[PDB]
Amino acid sequence: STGSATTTPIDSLDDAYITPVQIGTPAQTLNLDFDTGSSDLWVFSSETTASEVDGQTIYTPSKSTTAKLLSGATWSISYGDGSSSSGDVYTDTVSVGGLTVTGQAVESAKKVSSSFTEDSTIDGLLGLAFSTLNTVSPTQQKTFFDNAKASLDSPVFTADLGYHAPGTYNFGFIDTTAYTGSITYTAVSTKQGFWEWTSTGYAVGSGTFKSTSIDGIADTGTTLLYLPATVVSAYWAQVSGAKSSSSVGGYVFPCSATLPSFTFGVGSARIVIPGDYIDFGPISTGSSSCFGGIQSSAGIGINIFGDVALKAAFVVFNGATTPTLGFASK
Ligand SMILES: CCNCCOc1ccc(Cl)c(C)c1
């Protein structure tokens, strides 16, 4: 089997991407944030505290003839950005782009933190990291991809995120018309439950490539590119007037600037992030100070190849017995 679904930016800055997902019988379609950095499929629901729902579409398990309460199961997750959610668990039929899993754990939120409430466009998350990170207790549950894998034509999914435009998540096949050149594959460590890999270096604009190992995670659920402070300083030093602002929370730059590109290595291959992808717009409405798309990972504990990096590539998440990642230009 295969599936194919369009993923759409939630706003004009590409702050996140939503993909429609069918849950239950008859189908209830929710727009979920596919997150290769976590492993829970959780949704706003009829059980979510009412004051914490503000415009999201909810899953109502009592209206699904295939929903079954997973007796005794609870979940609670805290994300690296400080947001969180928790609740109870159903199993139900879940379909993405024509690919169907029966018996998928659907984690129904009783509580969500304020950042989720305040984002009316995200109805929940669909985790695509390794199932070892799933938070359901006392019986850990499998991700949608893990449940589908054995049925897929090939045990893979691909992320093709657009810049200020829709893109595609495919399951079970590699669309050879979606990228240019060849796909370069690179090794993955699953030891921390992430799609963790080692980039071979970077360049800033037309500068010379610096060969250096950068261990990080391919994370579709993180907006920006988080890299070591040395690399990030070298980038922003090429932008007149850019500076790290402790009060704003990262590097800011004059909105009048033309940003240089940023290149990252995948083996001997090179992915080029155009400068425009690194502009996240005014820090507050009407300001002439703009927020940078490349930020330091120093306070995080891991480097993160988030959407800013991944949208510049066609990315293969290869879930074969030994997982790997593939990157192609597009
Ligand atoms: C920490 C990086 N990714 C995991 C959390 O992802 C999101 C996505 C959407 C929203 Cl609204 C929030 C608050 C978090």
Side-chain angles (χ1 to χ4, degrees), residues 1-62 64-67 69-109 112-141 143-148 150-190 192-242 244-330:
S1 59
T2 62
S4 183
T6 299
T7 192
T8 302
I10 62 168
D11 62 23
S12 64
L13 301 175
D14 297 348
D15 282 317
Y17 299 75
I18 49 173
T19 308
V21 175
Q22 281 70 50
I23 309 175
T25 309
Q28 303 181 37
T29 299
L30 275 66
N31 296 327
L32 304 189
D33 184 349
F34 284 23
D35 181 13
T36 62
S38 71
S39 307
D40 286 53
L41 193 176
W42 74 261
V43 296
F44 277 80
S45 78
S46 58
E47 306 176 319
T48 308
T49 298
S51 70
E52 297 172 0
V53 185
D54 184 8
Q56 295 84 7
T57 294
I58 63 160
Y59 171 58
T60 304
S62 69
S64 174
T65 55
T66 44
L69 178 70
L70 187 58
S71 181
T74 61
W75 63 278
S76 179
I77 191 159
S78 297
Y79 296 102
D81 71 340
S83 66
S84 62
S85 51
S86 60
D88 57 13
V89 187
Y90 294 81
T91 59
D92 208 339
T93 301
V94 172
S95 297
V96 176
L99 168 66
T100 300
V101 166
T102 58
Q104 173 65 45
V106 174
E107 305 173 31
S108 166
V112 308
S113 69
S114 57
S115 288
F116 288 116
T117 301
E118 294 162 358
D119 190 352
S120 68
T121 69
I122 290 172
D123 304 323
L125 267 63
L126 189 150
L128 292 169
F130 294 86
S131 291
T132 54
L133 293 178
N134 176 265
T135 78
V136 178
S137 180
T139 307
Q140 191 172 59
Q141 303 293 305
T143 70
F144 175 81
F145 177 58
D146 261 12
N147 281 322
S151 300
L152 295 176
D153 289 358
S154 186
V156 304
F157 68 90
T158 65
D160 182 8
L161 304 180
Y163 167 67
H164 296 174
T168 307
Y169 281 101
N170 290 331
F171 292 82
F173 72 105
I174 288 165
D175 177 357
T176 61
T177 72
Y179 57 87
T180 65
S182 60
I183 304 178
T184 298
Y185 290 87
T186 196
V188 163
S189 172
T190 67
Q192 297 192 90
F194 298 122
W195 291 91
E196 188 171 1
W197 65 290
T198 301
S199 172
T200 48
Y202 69 96
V204 173
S206 60
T208 54
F209 187 84
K210 175 71 167 184
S211 294
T212 185
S213 293
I214 302 167
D215 181 290
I217 63 169
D219 185 1
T220 59
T222 290
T223 311
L224 307 185
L225 173 51
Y226 294 89
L227 290 175
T230 50
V231 178
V232 175
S233 184
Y235 179 82
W236 289 111
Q238 298 303 310
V239 179
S240 293
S244 184
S245 169
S246 63
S247 63
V248 173
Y251 279 89
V252 298
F253 68 94
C255 292
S256 61
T258 303
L259 296 178
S261 63
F262 185 87
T263 299
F264 64 95
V266 182
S268 48
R270 306 288 179 254
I271 300 296
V272 181
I273 306 173
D276 286 353
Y277 291 28
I278 299 161
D279 180 2
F280 280 74
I283 60 178
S284 293
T285 305
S287 181
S288 72
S289 187
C290 273
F291 199 68
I294 294 175
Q295 296 294 346
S296 176
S297 65
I300 298 180
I302 206 156
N303 300 306
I304 307 172
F305 294 88
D307 299 336
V308 163
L310 303 182
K311 77 177 66 180
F314 177 86
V315 188
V316 180
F317 294 77
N318 172 24
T321 305
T322 294
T324 65
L325 281 164
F327 293 82
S329 294
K330 65 188 186 191

